C-alpha cells in the first residue's frame, strides 16, 4: 500500500520493516511439519 500518512506516520514505517522481517523466517518455519519427513533422511544417514 505504502504510507499515505493520514494521521499516523511513525508507527507505519516502523512496523512496516518489522512485519517484513517476520515473513522471511515464518514461511520457512511453516515447512516444520514436513521437516519431520526430511528428518527421516537425516536419521537414515545417522544410523548408518
Amino acid at each position: 500500500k505504502k504510507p499515505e500518512t493520514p494521521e499516523e506516520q511513525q508507527w507505519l514505517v516502523e512496523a512496516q520493516q518489522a512485519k517484513q522481517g517476520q515473513q522471511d523466517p515464518a514461511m520457512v518455519q511453516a515447512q516444520g511439519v514436513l521437516l519431520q519427513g526430511q528428518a527421516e533422511l537425516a536419521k537414515a544417514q545417522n544410523q548408518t
Binding site: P3, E7, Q9, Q10, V13
Partner: protein, 48 residues
C-alpha cells in the same frame, strides 16, 4: 446541486462566525514537540 451550493457557502460563512475550522488533521501542538514548519515534510525527523 443547490444543497451542495449551500454547503459551498457553508465554509465561507460558518468559519468566520465560529472562528477557524481549517480541515484535515496535522501535528502542530504540544504533547512532545510543536509545529511542522521547517523545510520539506519528512519521515519522523525535524521535530521527530
Amino acid at each position: 446541486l443547490n444543497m451542495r451550493a449551500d454547503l459551498e457557502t457553508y465554509v465561507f460563512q460558518d468559519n468566520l462566525a465560529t472562528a477557524m475550522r481549517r480541515d484535515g488533521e496535522i501535528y502542530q501542538s504540544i504533547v512532545n514537540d510543536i509545529y511542522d514548519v521547517p523545510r520539506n515534510v519528512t519521515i519522523t525527523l525535524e521535530d521527530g
